[PDB]
Each structure stands twice: as structure tokens, then as C-alpha cells.
Amino acid sequence: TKGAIVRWGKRKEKLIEEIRAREEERNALVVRLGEIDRTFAVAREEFDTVVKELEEARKSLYEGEARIKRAEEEKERLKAEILTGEARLPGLRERAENLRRLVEEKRAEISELERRLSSITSQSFELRIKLSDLEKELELARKDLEKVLAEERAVREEIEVAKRRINELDTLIERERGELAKLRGRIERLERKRDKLKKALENPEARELTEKIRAVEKEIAALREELSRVEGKLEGL
């Protein structure tokens, strides 16, 4: 009927309008999601980079700590060498003083006994034997003194060398520690950037829009099905 043409026609125009509005909304949603997915591409590449760099930094940190431990074990060996050397020095200096004194003593004894041989000159032969014995003893005392003095000089030298090497090691350790502090800063900055990247990657509005787009598309489908029935009605009326 004419009246049914009018009524169904009014229904048709309403359906067309509502479909137009729903498809408008749906396109907007699709655009927004099309920006989110791009942001996730960018962020996921940066995240991959940053966790890589973070691995590199942690490896460098461990290696630096290991080099420091090696340097400090070497430092402790050298400290023990120095303490061992230093504990010998009072004894060596005592020996040297006593040997200088013994040397002077023997020289004076040789002078006195030579004086008696001078004054007397039968049993001066005994004094002459005593003389050669005093000469052997003085000679030995002098050779011992040379040996003690040389050994004290050698111990002092070896102490100085160990101390210089220890200073060297402390400078190496200071350099490593400076690098470790720089790496701890780099790691803190990387960890923070990485946590922000993860948080952006759990945003999670991407799914908030995927489900909503599913719904609005379902409703568009429903409206188009009613529209198709209404059209088929008007096309046979």
C-alpha cells in the first residue's frame, strides 16, 4: 500500500542514518588502533635495544669486579711480603752493629798482642799463633759484616719494589672502580627506560579497542541485515 511504502520508507532512512553513525564510530576506532599498533612497533624495537645494552653493561660490570678481586689478591700477597721483610730489619741492623763492634774489638786485640810481640822480641811463638788466629777472626767478622749489610740492603730494596707495585695496583683499582660507577649509572638509566617501555607495552588499550571494534562491527552487521529486509520489502511493494 501507499501508506506501507511511507512507513517502511521512514524505517529505511532511520536504518541508513544509524549505520552511517556506527560506521563513523568504527572508523575512528580503527584509526586510533592504527596509531597504537605503530607506537607498539616503535617501543618494541627500542625495548629490544635497551635490554641488549643492559646485558652488555652487566657483563662489563661483572668483568670489572673480577679484575678488581684479582688486583686485591695480588695486593695481599705483596703486603705479606712487605711485612715479612720488615720483621727482619731490626734483627739485621742489630747483627750489623754487633759485627762492627766485633771488628773494632779484634783490631784492638791485634794491636795489643802485636805490642807484646814487639816488646818481647822463646814463647813468642805462642803469641804469633794467637796473632794468626786473631787475624782469621777479624777477617771472618768483616766478611760477615759485608754479608749482613748486603742482605739488609736487599730486603729494603725488595720492600720498596713491593710498595711501588702496590701503589700501581691501587691506581689500577681506582680506574676500574671509576668505570664501575659509570656502569652503575648507565644501568640505572637503562633499567628505567626499559621499565617505561614495558609499561607502554602493557598499555593495554589496544585490546580495549579490538573488542569494542568487534562489538560495533557486530551491530553494523545487524543493522545491515534489517536494512536488507526493509529494502526487499520496499522493492516488492
Numbering used by the authors: 345 to 465, 696 to 811
Q: What is the paper's account of this structure, in its own sentences?
A:
Multi-subunit SMC complexes control chromosome superstructure and promote chromosome disjunction, conceivably by actively translocating along DNA double helices. SMC subunits comprise an ABC ATPase “head” and a “hinge” dimerization domain connected by a 49 nm coiled-coil “arm. The heads undergo ATP-dependent engagement and disengagement to drive SMC action on the chromosome. Here, we elucidate the architecture of prokaryotic Smc dimers by high-throughput cysteine cross-linking and crystallography.
